[PDB]
Amino acid sequence: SWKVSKPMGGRMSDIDPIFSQDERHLIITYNTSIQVYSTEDSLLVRRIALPLTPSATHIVSSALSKSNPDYLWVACSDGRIWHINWTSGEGVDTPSTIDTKKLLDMAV
Amino acid sequence: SWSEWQNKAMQADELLQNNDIQSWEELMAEVFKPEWEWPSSRSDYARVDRRWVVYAINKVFGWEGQNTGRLTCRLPESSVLIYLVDAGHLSTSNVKSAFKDDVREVDKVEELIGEQLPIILAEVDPTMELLVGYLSGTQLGSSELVSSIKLLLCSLGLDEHRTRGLGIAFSKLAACPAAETVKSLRRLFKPDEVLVLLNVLRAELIKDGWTTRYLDIQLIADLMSRCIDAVGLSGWMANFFSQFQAEISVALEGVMEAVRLKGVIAEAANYAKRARRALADSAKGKAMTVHMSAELPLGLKTDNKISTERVRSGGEIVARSSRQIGHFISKRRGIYSIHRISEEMLLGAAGPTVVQEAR
Amino acid sequence: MAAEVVPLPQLKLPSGPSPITAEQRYWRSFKKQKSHTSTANWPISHISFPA
Amino acid sequence: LGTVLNQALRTDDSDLLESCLQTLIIQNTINRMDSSLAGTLLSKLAARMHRRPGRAFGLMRWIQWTLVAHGGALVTQPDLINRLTELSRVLEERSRGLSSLLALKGKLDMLDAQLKYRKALKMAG
Amino acid sequence: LGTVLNQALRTDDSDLLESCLQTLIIQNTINRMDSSLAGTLLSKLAARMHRRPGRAFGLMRWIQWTLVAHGGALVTQPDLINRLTELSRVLEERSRGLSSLLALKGKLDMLDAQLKYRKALKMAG
Amino acid sequence: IISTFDIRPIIAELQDIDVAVGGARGAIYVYSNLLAHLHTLRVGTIQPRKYHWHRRAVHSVKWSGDGNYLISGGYETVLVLWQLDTGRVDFLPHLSAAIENIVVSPKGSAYALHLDDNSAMVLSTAEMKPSMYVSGIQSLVLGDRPSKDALVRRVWRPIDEIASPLVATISPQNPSHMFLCVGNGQQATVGGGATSTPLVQVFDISSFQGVAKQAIARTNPTDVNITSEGVPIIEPTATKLAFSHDGKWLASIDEWQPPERDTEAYLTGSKTQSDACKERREIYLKFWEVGADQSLELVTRINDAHYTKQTESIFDLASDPTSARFATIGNDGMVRFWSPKLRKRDGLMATRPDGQPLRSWSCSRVVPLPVHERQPYSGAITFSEDGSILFAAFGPPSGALVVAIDTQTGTVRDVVSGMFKGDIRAMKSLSSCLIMLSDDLVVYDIVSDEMLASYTLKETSEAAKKLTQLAVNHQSRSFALAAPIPKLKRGTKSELLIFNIEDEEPKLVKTFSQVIISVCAVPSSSGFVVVDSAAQVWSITEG
Amino acid sequence: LTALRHRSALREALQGRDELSVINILRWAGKYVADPRYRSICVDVAFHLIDLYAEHVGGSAELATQFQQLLAKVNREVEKAELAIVTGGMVESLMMSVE
Amino acid sequence: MDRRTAVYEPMAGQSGRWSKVFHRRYHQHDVKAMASFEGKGMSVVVSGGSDASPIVLPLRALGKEFHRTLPHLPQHPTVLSAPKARYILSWWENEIRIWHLLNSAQQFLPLNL
RNA sequence: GGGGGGAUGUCCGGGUCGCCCUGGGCACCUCUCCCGGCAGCCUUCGCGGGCAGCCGUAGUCCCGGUUCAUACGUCGCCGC
């Protein structure tokens, strides 16, 4: 009878909120979410939800791919790395593990 | 699981129509968890359930509907009744839940039941140990407590079990708020019964020692003030009130004297404790400022030992260097002091003897 | 969003059960008093002004 | 009266302290008292005040004036500090109902002045 | 002073009211005061006691004798209990702060006792 | 102790790097040239340039663009700019919360700040206004990365904890908005040993953005955040906040007592520092008129709402669903009904400068409650769904009791005792039955005088026992409680129970990976809205 | 002074003074304990002044009057506070008899 | 005059650009004079102020070695006593102050000190 | 702080009278484990756990006996 909606909102993680190329979008990575806002009107253009599930695994880092823009690299505390692309959502359901003990940081 | 209790209640109805009280009493003993031996604690009773409590009061007590009823003992000789008294289930909400049918038209129901019930317990037992146990066991409103004080003053005003409950009901009726105490006392008391009670409270005040001097409280002042406002001018309108206010002014001067002595004696005791600490450390040789003579200093200030920790910017805590401890000790010396070094110090064992000028 | 520097707000202390009202201060604000005596200390019969 | 108070306390007498208790000379008495002997005076005044609630119009001047001139000698006796810190604990317990007992003094100052009012009105009518 | 107090409380004067308040006399005044101006007197006493804290003794004396003299005279009124309510409010504010003020009174009584002891020493020296 | 660092490259080769290490003691050490110092066994003497302005740990340090300026930000809510060509320093001083993260744009123009109160502002340089503002839910979070100034053992070490549930109401007349109590930042809220949440924000539920924010208790954003000793100041917490039936009033309670370290000179006899801080409490009861633009305005403030010899704690307030009336239960015992009257002293009304009259709230009714002292009492109240009866649970330990009070007359309609095992946590009134929780959870019908469902909850710690709470729906007759699964810490789980009014089976049993801090009921429709610790919001609906 | 109680700095505000300004703050505390609208803040300031500066009271005679003159007005403000709770009982008696 | 001593080294890269490496308050009053020396394995800078204490800072190892506060009291003791008469004695600008002590130390083992 | 011991100094019955002891009063050094805090190093995502721990007091070669504070946008006069 009762149903539960998928979680929205989120707490902004301490990973740096990255600017897009040509400074028009801002990519803010929450816990369990990464969403792109526009700089001009301050309305969000996409919300890429991220399944986190193992009690405390957190999004460890996130950065634009320096080879090609409009990609990301999002990495958890356990071994998991996503290569999603903002303005779309291709890459959420296909992560790649890394065989760590616990992933403390990553930089691209 | 309502149907199981309904079948058990119908079986107890069959036992009632059989009029066999013994197996009914054993079934209530099994439920509450004849011989009927007791545990010796008003608190340590096992938890029972509300429907069996309601059925117990429904079978024991009774009501008369003539536009106003009367609780009566259908079972005036019952271990079930003394267990209800000792376990404190005889509350007005409990008996109203037991009698929702017959009382739903009745008004002033709390006043009627609170007037009727301690009278019923007192006519059950003339020794009123069951009334004192009810006073000590049940959640009691102000009507029940003023009727209980009426009962104990009917009994008095082998020979201490009544005065214990007389002490209990004063504490409970001091805990109650002013409005219900005044209205129930004005209802159920006569203006000479209140004078009897005010002589009992004077016996609790003067014999306790307040008017008495030394070389030769909050729970009784509430009762005295609530009785005085509950009678008012309609009851009285002699020298009794002048001697009354004389002894209350005497007790007030005693309490104010106790306030002054409380402040002075507490401050002198705290200074003596901290000065004992500082003198023990100065006898060890940590060389603090202590007062020498036997009068109190002007500022009741003792020098504490220097703490091992320091508060750095912005708020952090680090260890004190012994260098900085030595700097603060150099501040803590005076302008003249005799600092005797012993041969045991030069051997490396003991400490010095410092006698400094009194600042 | 640098918050603007606000000074310390004065305390709105509670007032007793007879405060000086707006109309009491409005009729106290008829401030400047000039008392012109009549000739030969005659009692004043009537003052008037046109509409 | 300086030398009667010295002998009455060393023997832990019960009667001879009371002979000096009822009778500015009181202040000049205890400024010359021996200080370890002065703590013996505080031990019995705290003994009678702790056992029963009461009052004493003369002892308020007595206890305070000894705790100033001879309170600095309280460091030498560890027994008396604990007796005074349980004494000032129970003197708080009398102090809790000062507000409720002052309201009782108000009603008696009300009713006694109203009972005298009707009695004067019967002689006035 | 009964008719003067009647005039002041009936026409809402300040000069007559203050010149009769600044001054036996008080008992005769409240006994010869009219019954209907008693609530007006209560409100005009609560106002002065709030506005000025240094006049509390005489104003509590006036309120005390008014509540003695005209008690049922305020009950036969009874839709005007709000004047007694404002009076209760003013007296509750006056009796605010008592436990901390008693603690500070003891903290100062120790200093006054030590200063008087050193004056008693310095006069004899 | 290194809190952060930013490296800038000195250049299509890589000639050198310049490292700015922001340490946990407050300083920023600039190591000017590194590859030419460690390129060359033996090295020359390297010595960083120290830039010390922040008292606490510096949260973020970045070089700015061309490399002239070194921008930085710490706990002191100030974006600082080291000029670095001169010796000077210029700063944007009074933000909302701690500057938790900064970035610089690809061009030199924009900065982007992640402020600690769940926010991001893209600022433009030397206009210095936020050209882009994004706000979140700002509630209390159990953080993953713990803290940047919990590294060096301060006076009060910042602990990731939730001590009390979040104070939040969904507002009728606009059910998409949610009023909820927040502090300046998350770290500035939890710092000081107590929740200091002297603000509310209105948060859109249908599109999850923080719409607006306002102060309720006294706050000083433009003053220094930290005392001279090093403890962060605490601000008055808004404990009880509940909203009126109309959509036009709001009543809040905020408490503040001085800290325990501060007294030290009020102790006279048996008074400990906790007793002195409890004596010196300040409990204001403020009535707010909510405008059409979600702007709150004061109408009255009551300084002592429940008073005896000292001030008394106020345990709950409730709004009558049929009128504009707020009931408040105190520690003196009495329940007070406050109602709005017009300001009128002697027939001459006082009006606002536009012309409308000034309303003011005042105590319409006082009801003394009966006590039953068998040989620290807490309270709970709720109206009916109809009005006309207010249920008031009064709460000494195990013996506690509910009183059903009429509203039109002040008389007691009923009293029910013996229904509480421990201390009362809360009580709500669905259509006929009282749903109340202590150590037990009981649905108790008063039209039948009969308890339907009774549960003995599992024994847990005192923090979890404080963090259990419920909420009723009042449209579809269903209630919902919330309890963390058994001192609190980061990895805890919680499970909420959806019950109907009539049966004993839980109609939805769902556990959550983080502890939920608040449950609320949408007033227009059925269902609930729940707010988690790792602060995400999600809605539950039937159908 | 309320802002200096709320920001934890009243001890810091009072701890650096000299003799004449201690006499000035004592004179303000004595003059303004009388109003019960700030009796709490005024008594707290007097607490901190007693805890800080009660050691020089024999050193300077003029401060020894100002500590005695503040006890003199604190002694008259328990009598005002006891007479207002005496009189508050009589008002409480009358509102009971109206019922 | 803010009793502050600041140390500057040139910024790496551009020439003629200095910047403050670090500052510290070594003195207790203003720093009115200082002079440097660098030779025979000793690079110091001596700063004298208004608190009479010359403070020696290491120059080439600054931030690597502790400083040193030389004594403000003169090297000659300037305190002389006649022990048979128990007179202690000290002199400055044009006065000689002589104290007599009148008693032993064994006698005192505080109102008499 | 307690539980306890080895040792310092002491009076009252004292003892063949000496080493001191038992009975009472005791203040200190040292040892011992529990009390409150602080750090390291392994384990686990965390929660917690494990290992060998230091501090609860006193004076230093010199010396952290330091480092640390919250902007601009505009001023003046009078009125409600």
DSSP, residue by residue, B264-309: HHHHHHHHHHHHHHHHHHHHHT-------SSSPPSS---PPPPPSE
Do the Cβ atoms of F47 and H17 come within 8 Å? no
Q: Cβ distance D101 to B221 under 8 Å?
A: yes
Q: Cβ distance H50 to H32 under 8 Å?
A: yes
DSSP E strand boundaries for D1-125: none
- To the nearest whole Å, the CA of B314 is away from the closest chain D CA by 40
With the C-alpha atoms ordered B176, B177, B183, B185, is the resulting torsion angle positive or negative? positive
Q: Does F88 touch chain D (CB under 8 A)?
A: no
CA distance B181 to F37: 89
Cα torsion B173, B179, B184, B190 to 10°: value is 90
Beta-carbon contacts of B33 under 8 Å, excluding residues fewer than 6 positions away, are: B46, B48
Please give the helix or strand (H or E) that residue E112 lies within, else none. helix E98-124
Q: Nearest-CA neighbor of F293 among F359, F351, F181, F214?
A: F214
Cis check for the bond before B314: say yes or no (omega within 30 of 0): yes
**Residues 458-517 (F) near nucleic chain I, CB < 7 A:** 487, 489-491
How do A59-64 and F469-472 pair as beta strands? unpaired
CA distance E28 to D124: 14
Alpha helices in D54-97 (DSSP H): 59-69, 78-95
Coil, helix or strand at residue F79: strand
Q: Token pair for residue D124? A: 């006035």
Report the amino acid identity of residue F159.
I
φ/ψ (deg, to 5) at F177: -95, 150
**Residues 138-157 (F) near nucleic chain I, CB < 7 A:** 153, 157
Cα torsion F128, F131, F136, F140 to 10°: value is 0
Query: Angle CA(B339)–CA(B340)–CA(B344) in degrees, nearest 5?
Result: 135
Q: Classify residue G35 as exposed, middle or buried by CB count within 10 Å of its CB (0-12, 13-18, 19+).
A: middle
Report the amino acid identity of residue E107.
K
Q: Cβ distance A32 to A50 under 8 Å?
A: yes
The 3 state secondary structure assigned to F387-431 is CCEEEEEEECCCCCEEEEEECCCCCEEEEEECCCCCCCCEEEECC
Q: Cβ distance F539 to F473 under 8 Å?
A: no
CA distance B13 to B17: 6
CA distance E76 to B242: 28
Do the Cβ atoms of B255 and D101 come within 8 Å? yes
Q: Token pair for residue B128? A: 């009123």
- Evaluate if the CB of F224 falls below 7 Å from strand I: yes
**Sole residue written with tokens 């009107």:** A41
**Sole residue written with tokens 């002033």:** B108
Coil, helix or strand at residue E122: helix
- To the nearest whole Å, the CA of B264 is away from the closest chain H CA by 27
Percent composition of chain H: helix, strand, coil (DSSP 3-state, to 5):
5, 45, 50
Q: Nearest-CA neighbor of F459 among F439, F433, F473?
A: F439
Q: Cβ distance A16 to F101 under 8 Å?
A: yes
How crowded is residue B304: how many other Cβ atoms within 10 Å of its Cβ? 11
**Residues 264-293 (B) near nucleic chain I, CB < 7 A:** 280, 283-284, 286-288
Q: Classify residue F23 as exposed, middle or buried by CB count within 10 Å of its CB (0-12, 13-18, 19+).
A: buried
Q: Token pair for residue F273? A: 């520092």
Q: Does E71 touch chain D (CB under 8 A)?
A: yes
CA distance F240 to H6: 54
Nucleotides on chain I that have an atom closer than 7 A to a protein CB are 27-29, 38-39, 44-48, 55-60, 62-73
Q: Does G96 touch chain E (CB under 8 A)?
A: no
Nearest chain G residue to B179, by CA: G96
CA distance D47 to D36: 17
CA distance G6 to F219: 10
Q: Classify residue H92 as exposed, middle or buried by CB count within 10 Å of its CB (0-12, 13-18, 19+).
A: exposed
**Residue A23 Rama label (left phi>0; alpha psi -120 to 50; beta):** left
- To the nearest whole Å, the CA of E50 is away from the closest chain C CA by 6
Q: Does B255 touch chain E (CB under 8 A)?
A: no
Q: What residues of chain H lie within 8 A of the CB of B358, using their CB?
A: 110-111, 113
**Residues 74-93 (A) near nucleic chain I, CB < 7 A:** 77-78
Q: Nearest-CA neighbor of F178 among F532, F523, F504, F438?
A: F523
How crowded is residue C43: how many other Cβ atoms within 10 Å of its Cβ? 5
Q: Classify residue E79 as exposed, middle or buried by CB count within 10 Å of its CB (0-12, 13-18, 19+).
A: exposed
**CB nearest D110 (choices: E68, E120, E124):** E68
Q: Token pair for residue E57? A: 């003794």
Q: Token pair for residue B216? A: 């030769």
Inter-CA distances, F353 with C22, D11, F249, F350, Å: 13, 85, 21, 10
CA distance F443 to F430: 9
CA distance F193 to F462: 16
Q: Token pair for residue A48? A: 């890429």
Alpha helices in chain B (DSSP H): 2-18, 21-32, 50-60, 79-87, 92-98, 100-103, 109-124, 129-137, 142-155, 161-175, 178-188, 193-206, 221-231, 233-236, 239-284, 322-332, 343-347
Q: Token pair for residue B329? A: 């000790």
Q: Cβ distance A45 to A88 under 8 Å?
A: no
CA distance F77 to G4: 21
Inter-CA distances, B87 with B61, B94, H21, Å: 16, 13, 81
**Which nucleotide is closest to F230, CA to C1'?**
I68
Q: Cβ distance G27 to G66 under 8 Å?
A: yes
Count the helices and strands in chain E (H runs, E runs).
8, 0
Q: Nearest-CA neighbor of F27 among F60, F54, F63, F3?
A: F54
**Which nucleotide is closest to B317, CA to C1'?**
I38
Q: What residues of chain F lie within 8 A of the CB of C6, using their CB?
A: 222
How crowded is residue F240: how many other Cβ atoms within 10 Å of its Cβ? 18
Nearest chain C residue to F345, by CA: C21
Q: Nearest-CA neighbor of F195 among F255, F242, F241, F148?
A: F255
Report the neighbours of A using a cutoff of 3 or more CB pairs below 8 angstroms.
F
Q: Token pair for residue G70? A: 């503040």
From the CB coordinates, do chains E and H have 3 or more pairs under 8 Å? no
**Which nucleotide is closest to F222, CA to C1'?**
I70
Report the amino acid identity of residue B97.
S
DSSP state, F210? E
Coil, helix or strand at residue F214: strand
Q: How many CB pairs under 8 A join F and G?
A: 30
Say how many Å lie between the first and final Cα of chain C, rounded.
58
Coil, helix or strand at residue E95: coil
Sheet bearing F2-10, strands edge to edge: F2-10, F16-23, F27-31, F49-52
CA distance B263 to D87: 11
**CB nearest B298 (choices: G58, G93, G99):** G58
Q: Token pair for residue G5? A: 């109680």
DSSP letters of F223-265?
Answer: S-SB-SSSPBPP--EEEEEEE-SSSSEEEEEEEE---TTT-SS
Q: Cβ distance B130 to B82 under 8 Å?
A: yes
Report the neighbours of H using a cutoff of 3 or more CB pairs below 8 angstroms.
B, F
Q: Nearest-CA neighbor of D53 among D102, D97, D117, D13?
A: D97
Do the Cβ atoms of F268 and E92 come within 8 Å? no
From the CB coordinates, do chains B and H have 3 or more pairs under 8 Å? yes
Integer Rg of chain E from CA: 20
**CB nearest B296 (choices: E71, E102, E114):** E114
Q: Token pair for residue B130? A: 């069951």
DSSP letters of B101-124?
Answer: HHHTT-SSHHHHHHHHHHHHHHHH
Q: Does F129 touch chain D (CB under 8 A)?
A: no
Do the Cβ atoms of G48 and F258 come within 8 Å? no
Q: Does B229 touch chain G (CB under 8 A)?
A: yes
Q: Token pair for residue B21? A: 């009280």
Q: Nearest-CA neighbor of D106 among B174, E50, G93, E41?
A: G93
**Residues 299-338 (B) near nucleic chain I, CB < 7 A:** 305-308, 312-314, 318, 320-327, 329-330, 333
Residues listed for chain A:
108
Report the neighbours of B using a cutoff of 3 or more CB pairs below 8 angstroms.
D, E, F, G, H
Beta-carbon contacts of C8 under 8 Å, excluding residues fewer than 6 positions away, are: G3
CA distance F531 to F533: 7
**Residue F474 Rama label (left phi>0; alpha psi -120 to 50; beta):** left
Q: Cβ distance F99 to F59 under 8 Å?
A: yes
Q: Token pair for residue H31? A: 């720093």
How do H95-100 and H87-92 pair as beta strands? antiparallel
Report the amino acid identity of residue F291.
G
Q: Cβ distance A17 to F120 under 8 Å?
A: yes
